[PDB]
Structures are given as C-alpha cells and as structure tokens.
Ligand binder design. Structure first.
Ligand SMILES: Nc1nc(Nc2ccc(S(N)(=O)=O)cc2)nn1C(=O)c1c(F)cccc1F
Length: 272
C-alpha cells in the first residue's frame, strides 16, 4: 500500500460511520501526471482509536480490493498511518451509497435501472469469483454510484463495489447477528465458514435492497428474532416490484453448495 503523509490530507465533512470507523470527505494534495499539482477529492476511512486492535483486518479489507484491478471495484489511493491514525485513502464516488440513492429517488427508478445495476454488480462478483477472491460484505451501502442514468443520451447508471471493511471473521457475534440477513446462516453458525458462497447469499440480499427502494430487510426484527429467522429457514418476502424475487431466493439458498455461480446469475439477469 502506498503511504500518504498526514500533511497532504485535509479532513472535511463527515459522511457517516462504518463498523469501528468514522468516514469523512477530504482532499489529497499530490503530484500527478506530468508533474502537475492536484488537490484531489478523496474518501477517508478512519479506524477508531479505541479499536486500533482491528488495524490489520481493517487494512486487509482494502488490500483485498487492491489485489486486482477492475472497472467495477473502488480504487484505493493508499493509507495514512502517521501518528496514532489508521486511515484508508479511497476514491471519492460522486453520488454516494446505493441504499441512500434508492431511498431518495424511489419514484424515479424503474425495473430497467435496477436490472442494469444488478448486472453490473453481478459482473464485479463474477470477476471476483473467477479470481477466487472473497468480498465478505456485499450490501447496498457498499455499492457506490459513479454516474446517474441519463435517458436523454441513453447512458446507463454506473456503479462500483466498495471494500468490505473489517472482516466478519473477527467481528463480535452481536454485530454479526445484527447483520442478518446479509451474513449467511453458515457464517452465523461459524464465521470461519466465510467462503465464495457467502457473497452469493449476500448478493441476493443486496438485490432485495435494490428492489425495495432502499429498505432494510428484517429491520423490524431484533437480533434474537433474526437468529430465529435463520433457525426456522425463512426467506425474505418478495419486493413489491418482484421481478427479481426468484433470483433473490435462489441466491439466498440455505445450502451454500447449491447457490448458483455468478455466470449463471448473469445469464438469468440477461434473460429478463
Ligand atoms: N468511496 C466512497 N465514496 C463515497 N462518496 C459519497 C458518499 C456519500 C455521499 S452523501 N452526500 O452522503 O449522499 C456522497 C458521496 N462514499 N464512499 C464509500 O466508500 C462509503 C461507503 F461505501 C459506505 C458508506 C459511506 C461511504 F463514504
């Protein structure tokens, strides 16, 4: 990972929180191509000092996303570990997280938009599966909108997948339970069961989000009732716009070995 100096980073407005992290929009002063000076918008993820003991996992996440290069994977510029800080320096995606966008733009997102976004995410996950690289936290909040759909020029929307953050393999059990139903049942049973099939399940949950105008599945259930939801083998209800409900349920198969490959997922999406 490229080391960025604290003096080249300016912290601006807060953009919320992650798991044991605080998030800020910022600026990186840098020498760019041809020796030109740039002051570039960046996204700064800051591990909580009180949780410094997660630093390794915190950075492993980013390392995962930077192992390979792909048009649908967020770019990491580097890290800042000056002083007592553990900072990830990431590309700033103009239009933010997909769940927020879906909530704010419900009455203007049709099935074609959601189908294109789903195909793009499936392409990213197929790229990861071919490379046998586990993401571990596919969710609408970790999908970032680079470009809005412009039906006046035919331009589709364009999305990227962000980093998964601290792995579910080291997170406390109560956080994992709160992450039902993105975390698959075999990972509630044993977080060391993290596997490629995990991302197929979570991809299903993410499709549910995309089709549900940004609602969170099972948000009305507390952690104990989410646990029991998995124990009684329930599936998510079909979204009102149910065009993708069969694919959602096929991805959210309680048998991990039965979840379809992302190539079959993509064929399914293209058939619609
Ligand atoms: N890499 C990245 N870029 C952005 N851009 C962004 C974020 C929020 C807004 S706004 N005004 O709240 O709607 C506008 C632009 N986010 N981002 C992330 O990794 C990220 C994430 F994945 C989840 C949550 C927060 C994040 F910050």
């Amino acid at each position: 990972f490229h080391k960025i100096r604290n003096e080249d980073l300016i912290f601006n407005e807060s953009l919320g929180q992650g798991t044991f992290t605080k998030i800020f929009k910022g600026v990186r002063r840098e020498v760019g191509d041809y020796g030109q000076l740039h002051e570039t918008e960046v996204l700064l993820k800051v591990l909580d000092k009180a949780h410094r003991n997660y630093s390794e996992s915190f950075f492993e996440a980013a390392s995962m996303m930077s192992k390979l290069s792909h048009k649908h994977l967020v770019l990491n510029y580097g890290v800042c570990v000056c002083g007592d800080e553990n900072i990830l320096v990431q590309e700033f995606v103009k239009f933010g997280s997909l769940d927020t966008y879906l909530k704010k733009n419900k009455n203007c997102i049709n099935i074609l938009w959601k189908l294109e976004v789903a195909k793009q995410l499936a392409a990213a996950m197929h790229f990861l599966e071919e490379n046998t690289l586990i993401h571990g936290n596919v969710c609408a909040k970790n999908i970032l909108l680079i470009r809005e759909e412009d039906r006046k020029t035919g331009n589709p929307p364009f999305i990227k997948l962000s980093d998964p953050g601290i792995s579910i393999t080291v997170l406390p059990k109560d956080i994992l339970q709160e992450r039902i139903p993105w975390v698959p049942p075999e990972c509630i049973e044993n977080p060391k069961n993290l596997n490629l099939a995990t991302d197929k399940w979570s991809f299903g949950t993410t499709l549910w989000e995309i089709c549900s105008g940004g609602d969170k599945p099972l948000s009305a259930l507390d952690s104990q009732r989410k646990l029991q939801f998995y124990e009684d083998r329930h599936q998510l209800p079909a979204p009102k716009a149910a065009e993708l409900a069969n694919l959602i349920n096929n991805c959210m198969d309680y048998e991990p070995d039965h979840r379809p490959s992302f190539r079959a997922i993509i064929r399914d999406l293209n058939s619609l």
